[PDB]
Design a binder for this molecule. Structure first.
Ligand SMILES: Nc1nc2c(ncn2[C@@H]2O[C@H](COP(=O)(O)OP(=O)(O)OP(=O)(O)O)[C@@H](O)[C@H]2O)c(=O)[nH]1
Ligand SMILES: [Mg+2]
Lengths: 18, 137, 180, 415
């Protein structure tokens, strides 16, 4: 864990925008 | 997807209850991935909705679409931005490629009655991209 | 925490308490304080400043801070209002013209939001001349019964004799201490 | 157009000096201290001094003032930027900025000062890039400085490819004494710690309102950042063309983008405080804090600073939740709360004494500042959409990012 909000994985790009 | 199957009946019931025509903040689930819905994921969701029913032929409404997008985001982590339809009047194609759902007239495009209709050609032909190349970049 | 030491101290007497000595000049305040502390009527010059003393009675250190009645010292009574637990008012029944001034000073001092826990202590000083009033005429004139949320007690003490000092001390102890 | 960059101290002694043009005599630094003392004692003290025809523009550091003498009509902004870059380089190289390292790290400090700026014109400011040519414990200069990419050294290899992001929120609220908020600005901060192999070209993608409108999705939750300031690695042309945030992330932690937009929402914390200060008798502090934020969010380490009287002594606090302590060094009541669930309501009743003797001069009313820091809460609603990590060799990146919400310039004006 970590104070200030747990780190979350990020996407690669807008998959819904092609 | 057991969770998706369980949420499909409740989501369909909520959409049916809402007619066709309180808490502040933006909480985020810890460690829950957030990303735009993929073309394969959109196609799978459209196929599941067509098989289970409740989405094909239902009257299109802003509240029902928002509820469906929120349920999809909660159950899969997909941003509620890929469920966009092309501007009217007439048949509106999905904004995101791979989506098999589309809105067609049932009778100003805002006052026109639209209903969700399955379309397998949407996942293969970029109708929305062709209609609006500027919107697709 | 442990309060065994406090209980042991209280078994033989621990509370001391405080007191104040205010009033008009030449009102028997210095003589009253000398009689309470020593037991003799000592003649002293007018209180230009202030006098601080203590009285040991009933296992309680009754510290009395005499305050003069000078015009330049009237507004200096607010200095003693800090860290003050008691207050004794000395009236001057032998000065008819100064009775109104004393009543006005008492009303001004009693109209302070910080001096609220100090109970009223009216002392009838100069109880040796025939012109002195009773223990009710002075209170009625000063309206001591109109002091809401104030425990007032009028006691007549003779500066030359000293009678009534024990009764006033007992009343003050009963008002301050709420135990057996 | 600085003539000589020098580092002073708190006693007026110049810790280190480095002339760049030599057009100003080194003895002019002696008059800087008396001039600064006169300006401070008369209210005319400013970071940009002027010793006759020579201007002394410098800022005050932790322990010494980095004064840079100049005589011509040099760019003050350029001098300030050079001073900020030098301070950042010193912080990166030396963990502390005090006189202990000035007199101990002169061997590397002189080399860094000589290499950074020549003839008053700085050439290199990257601490990571500069660490490969000047060390305190020399090979040819790296090609990164010579090449266009001067913020990403080539050849970096790591066992894993993990990039940690930090979406830090700054809740700044300027509430007047009448109860209305005047300046309510929220400044986003996208700080990422990129640790990958090679020189990946990050393609940042978020749910920007402008991007959604351009793509045609201007109907969902889109962040409306009034000002967006990209880092040096971010290409300005790419962002200006079609809102394409394409840049090469550096090796380490750096600020890529910093959004800054106004906020029109209600405050996350509503503070209702009263001052029942008697005239030299006592004082009352009926402070009530109402959390307007979402209940699912908890404000870790909530510190609502309540300025109490300067001469107040023997104070008593009657609160509900959280430890309240009065610090004589700061002369205020520190409403310290460890965990504050959203929607919580804390009520406090202060009571402190006051001396009978009035103060000689007025002390003013310092604003009440809250130190709420609620992690995992994005007030602006901006969410990261994608991060295109592309490498020539080809690898699977594992980007990470966290959202942190804190209180910035969240001061409350007193009555
Ligand atoms: N003879 C006589 N005089 C009294 C008596 N009671 C009060 N006095 C007068 O009251 C005065 C008391 O003054 P002090 O005892 O020195 O102190 P004080 O009452 O505070 O007067 P100041 O110092 O001026 O404020 C004396 O000078 C007396 O003249 C009394 O019972 N007999
Ligand atoms: Mg006297």
């Amino acid at each position: 864990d970590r104070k200030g909000g747990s780190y979350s994985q990020a996407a690669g790009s807008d998959s819904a925008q092609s | 997807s057991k969770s998706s199957v369980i949420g499909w009946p409740a989501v369909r019931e909520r959409m049916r209850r809402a007619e066709p025509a309180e808490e502040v903040g933006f909480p985020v689930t810890p460690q829950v991935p957030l990303r735009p819905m993929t073309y394969k994921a959109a196609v799978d969701l459209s196929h599941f909705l067509k098989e289970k029913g409740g989405l094909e032929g239902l009257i299109h409404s802003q509240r029902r679409q928002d509820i469906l997008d929120l349920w999809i985001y909660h159950t899969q982590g997909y941003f509620p931005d890929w469920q966009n339809y092309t501007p009217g009047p007439g048949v509106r194609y999905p904004l995101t490629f791979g989506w098999c759902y589309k809105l067609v007239p049932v009778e100003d495009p805002e006052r026109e009655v639209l209903e969700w209709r399955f379309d397998s050609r949407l996942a293969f032909h970029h109708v929305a991209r062709e209609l609006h190349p500027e919107y697709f970049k | 925490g442990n309060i065994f030491a406090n209980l042991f101290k209280g078994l033989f007497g621990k509370k001391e308490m405080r007191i104040l000595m205010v009033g008009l000049d030449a009102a028997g305040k210095t003589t009253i304080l000398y009689k309470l502390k020593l037991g003799e009527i000592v003649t002293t010059i007018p209180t230009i400043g202030f006098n601080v003393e203590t009285v040991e009675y009933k296992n309680i250190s009754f510290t009395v801070w005499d305050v003069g009645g000078q015009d330049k010292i009237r507004p200096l009574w607010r200095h003693y209002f800090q860290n003050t637990q008691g207050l004794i008012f000395v009236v001057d029944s032998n000065d008819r013209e100064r009775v109104n001034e004393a009543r006005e000073e008492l009303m001004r001092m009693l109209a302070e939001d910080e001096l609220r826990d100090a109970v009223l202590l009216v002392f009838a000083n100069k109880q040796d001349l025939p012109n002195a009033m009773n223990a009710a005429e002075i209170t009625d004139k000063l309206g001591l019964h109109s002091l809401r949320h104030r425990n007032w007690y009028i006691q007549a003490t003779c500066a030359t004799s000293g009678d009534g000092l024990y009764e006033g001390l007992d009343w003050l102890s009963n008002q301050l201490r709420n135990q057996k | 157009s600085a003539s000589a960059v020098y580092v002073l101290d708190l006693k007026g002694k110049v810790l280190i000096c480095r002339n760049y043009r030599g057009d100003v005599d080194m003895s002019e630094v002696e008059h800087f201290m008396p001039i600064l003392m006169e300006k401070e004692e008369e209210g005319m003290l400013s970071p940009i001094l002027a010793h006759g025809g020579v201007r002394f523009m410098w800022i005050k550091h932790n322990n010494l003032y980095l004064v840079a003498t100049s005589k011509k009509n040099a760019c003050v902004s350029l001098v300030f930027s050079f001073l900020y870059k030098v301070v950042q380089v010193f912080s990166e190289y030396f963990k502390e900025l005090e006189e202990e390292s000035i007199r101990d790290n002169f061997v590397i400090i002189y080399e860094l000062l000589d290499e950074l700026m020549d003839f008053g014109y700085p050439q290199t400011t990257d601490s990571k890039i500069l660490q490969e040519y000047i060390t305190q414990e020399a090979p040819r200069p790296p090609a990164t400085v010579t090449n266009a990419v001067s913020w990403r050294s080539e050849g970096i290899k790591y066992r894993k490819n993990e990039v940690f992001l930090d979406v830090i929120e700054a809740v700044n609220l300027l509430v007047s004494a009448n109860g209305n908020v005047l300046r309510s600005e929220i400044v986003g901060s996208i700080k990422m710690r990129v640790f990958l192999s090679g020189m990946p070209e990050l393609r940042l993608g978020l749910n920007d309102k402008v991007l959604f409108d351009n793509t045609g999705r201007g109907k969902s939750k889109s962040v409306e950042l009034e000002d967006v300031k990209f880092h040096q690695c971010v290409r300005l042309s790419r962002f200006e063309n079609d809102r394409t945030i394409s840049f090469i992330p550096p090796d380490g932690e750096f600020e890529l983008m910093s959004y800054r937009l106004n906020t029109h929402v209600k405050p996350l914390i509503w503070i209702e405080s009263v001052i029942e200060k008697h005239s030299h008798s006592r004082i009352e502090y009926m402070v009530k804090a109402k959390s307007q934020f979402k209940r699912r969010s908890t404000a870790n380490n909530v510190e609502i600073h309540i300025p109490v009287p300067n001469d107040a002594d023997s104070p008593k606090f009657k609160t509900t939740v959280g430890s309240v302590k009065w610090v004589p060094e700061n002369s205020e009541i520190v409403w310290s709360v460890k965990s504050f669930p959203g929607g919580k309501e804390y009520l406090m009743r202060a009571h402190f004494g006051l001396p009978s003797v009035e103060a000689e001069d007025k002390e003013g009313k310092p604003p009440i500042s809250v130190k709420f820091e609620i992690p995992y809460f994005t007030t602006s609603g901006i969410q990261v959409r994608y991060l295109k990590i592309i490498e020539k060799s080809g690898y699977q990146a594992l980007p990470w990012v966290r959202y942190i919400t804190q209180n910035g310039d969240y001061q409350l004006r007193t009555q």
